[PDB]
């Protein structure tokens, strides 16, 4: 592999792993469209299983990018419109605060303060209906962004209703299969369990627990190869043969809202390239990423901008993931780790690598 890539990756990631005490890590760099892979450490410390290119990691909220694209694909199929009221797809949602809340608001965290998490107490479908019916918005729709699993998770569940497919069936048939992501899963099958890394939290081996809207908000597991392929697909959607999927990918990178120097897509978030690295590095810190922020509507949304830093962070209890790419440069990176370590360290390392190669 080109020595420049080897050197920039190893010189950045080796110290990262040491500083953050990350048990296992995989990195893919997409350079001029081609992937290059790097692995370190352990998928399972107790069983001495190394990280390989076939190791599954929990993506956490990087799953939101799959949800956004699947939603985009449903728009392209004509099954849903982002302008459609939430109640069109969930008629039981009769409470008056839902008047004016559209699928766009759900997809982009702008419904008016839907909470970061669905309460753990919500176990049944009746529980979920009660939760949304009883929720009281802090703000009018389309005025403030508050990053939330309960927002985009509901979008994902509603987006697949017209198809009649379960969220998982829709994801597999309409996104995973066409892109040949054959080692990407919402539920890890028994056949693949030998490859499923443990996450590590406070030294304990952990996997994500079941929760409401988990598949839709944070539930995808994948390998570094499949994730490199996901980045390639999002870098160059025009190479994708399935028309509605190609279109869905483009819709997910459209710019719907602006807050500061960031633009909200469907799942993806974007900044203009060249970026100010302090802006994305500091902006990734949950102190900022999870805050309530006023948004400016982009009316109408700007289609995907090639000169963008497009990215998403993800975490579960035991895992930390990051994906970033720059379409204009045919350049991208995926970093998957089995420890949830601070976001700014992820973005700093990714920027150091992509900047050196650009």
Curated annotation (Swiss-Prot):
Question: What does the UniProt entry list as the effect of changing residue 286 to A?
Answer: Reduces binding affinity of inhibitor compound 1 about 17-fold
Q: What is the effect of changing residue 61 to D/E/G?
A: Loss of activity
Keywords of the record, alphabetical order, are: Antibiotic resistance, Hydrolase, Periplasm, Signal
Cited Pfam families: Beta-lactamase (PF00144)
UniProt activity-regulation remark: Inhibited by the beta-lactamase-blocking agents avibactam, enmetazobactam, relebactam, nacubactam, vaborbactam, taniborbactam, zidebactam, and beta-lactam-analog boronic acids, via a covalent binding to Ser-61. Inhibited by non-beta-lactam, benzo(b)thiophene-2-boronic acid (BZBTH2B) and various cyclic boronates. Not inhibited by clavulanic acid. Inhibited by O-aryloxycarbonyl hydroxamates, via cross-linking of the active site Ser-61 to Lys-312. Weakly inhibited by citric acid.
Describe what happens upon changing residue 116 to A.
Reduces binding affinity of inhibitor compound 3 about 4-fold
For this record, the Gene Ontology CC terms, alphabetical, are: outer membrane-bounded periplasmic space
Which GO terms label this protein's molecular function in UniProt? beta-lactamase activity
Q: What class of enzyme is it?
A: hydrolase
- Gene Ontology BP terms: antibiotic catabolic process; response to antibiotic
Its annotated compartments are: Periplasm
Enumerate the active-site residues.
Answer: 61
Q: What is its EC number?
A: 3.5.2.6
* Outcome reported for the amino acid change (mutating residue 149 to A): Lowers activity more than 6000-fold
Similarity comment: family membership: Belongs to the class-C beta-lactamase family.
NCBIfam families in the cross-refs: bla_class_C, BlaEC, CMY2-MIR-ACT-EC
**Reported function:** Class C beta-lactamase which confers resistance to penicillins and cephalosporins. Has benzylpenicillin- and cephaloridine-hydrolyzing activity. Has weak cefuroxime, cefotaxime, cefoxitin and oxacillin-hydrolyzing activities.
Annotated protein name in UniProt: Beta-lactamase
User: Which organism was this protein described from?
Assistant: Escherichia coli (strain K12)
Q: Highest lineage ranks of the organism? A: Bacteria, Pseudomonadati, Pseudomonadota, Gammaproteobacteria, Enterobacterales
